[PDB]
Design a protein around this ligand. Structure first.
Ligand SMILES: c1cc2c(ncc3ncn(C4CCNCC4)c32)[nH]1
Length: 290
């Protein structure tokens, strides 16, 4: 129930293939005492893209969890229906940027804490048969030193009643370096495809986001940087098909790297569950404690 006139633009928080997110202050009193919120809108507003957004809004409105970014509401001139999603604003921003800025403060124990939180949110999603389909550190938000949330659901899809995967091919650019093989080859997205991406997220975390060590770089290094266009995808597939994998990050413990590789099983059903992951991560943490 947000009125556009009282939305004061502060800054840009991010961009998407066809969306963006702004930091705004909602100040109806025009006394500058309103809260600061996050606003997502569309850049390309095709009837198709609207359908998706409306669905994204529904999905988010339907989620209630400590590790999921809070839906605050919607706004639209009515008007040509210039739809806008209002979410809570997280002051520490994306886990990706945070992690980078504070590598010196954040130890492995702490990475495991966030890791575990992510699993709990992912598990909550799978509960509603939602496939996230864009798991990444950019897309995790930091609410405070001790808590993260999943903060974007632009690509999230709901599973059909009678199937455990969803087939979908997206126009233009895909985060292929986070994509599971069946996603690359069949455009198949399942909880298990989400676990594959989680593995990469875990990887991201333990690279502390050093640029030379990113998935795209590490894979391109592995494929050879002469590759371009479609060819990149094709080599990527061949590479994974032959058990090529991202390397253990500098300083990563073997037990942690093992979790990553279990996530990066070619064999879809041999990938762990989010509940399993959380338990194993938590067990590990406990062992770190003493
Ligand atoms: C909602 C998003 C959101 C937020 N609060 C702070 C954020 N910083 C970056 N983001 C991005 C925007 C681009 N997509 C990933 C999240 C933030 N609240």
């Amino acid at each position: 129930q947000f009125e556009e006139r009282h939305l004061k633009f502060l800054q840009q928080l991010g961009k998407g293939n066809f969306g963006s997110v702004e930091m705004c202050r909602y100040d109806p009193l025009q006394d500058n005492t309103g809260e600061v919120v996050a606003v997502k809108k569309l850049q390309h507003s095709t009837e198709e893209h609207l359908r998706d957004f409306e669905r994204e809004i529904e999905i988010l409105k339907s989620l209630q969890h400590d590790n999921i970014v809070k839906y605050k509401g919607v706004c639209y001139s009515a008007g040509r229906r210039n739809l806008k999603l209002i979410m809570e604003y997280l002051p520490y921003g994306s886990l990706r940027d945070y992690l980078q800025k504070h590598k010196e403060r954040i130890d492995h124990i702490k990475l495991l804490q966030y890791t575990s939180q992510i699993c709990k949110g992912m598990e909550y999603l799978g509960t509603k048969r939602y496939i996230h389909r864009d798991l990444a550190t950019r897309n995790i938000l930091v609410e405070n030193e001790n808590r993260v949330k999943i903060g974007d659901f632009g690509l999230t899809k709901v599973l059909p009643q009678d199937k455990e995967y969803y087939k979908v091919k997206e126009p233009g650019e895909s985060p292929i370096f986070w994509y599971a093989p069946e996603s690359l080859t069949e455009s198949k997205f399942s909880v298990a495809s989400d676990v594959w991406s989680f593995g990469v997220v875990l990887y991201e975390l333990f690279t502390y986001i050093e640029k030379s060590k990113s998935p795209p770089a590490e894979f391109m290094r592995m494929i050879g940087n002469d590759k371009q266009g479609q060819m990149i995808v094709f080599h990527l597939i061949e590479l994974l098909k032959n058990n090529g994998r991202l390397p253990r990050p500098d300083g990563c413990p073997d037990e942690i790297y093992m979790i990553m590789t279990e996530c990066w099983n070619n064999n879809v059903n041999q990938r762990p569950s989010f509940r399993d992951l959380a338990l194993r991560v938590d067990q590990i943490r406990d062992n770190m404690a003493g």
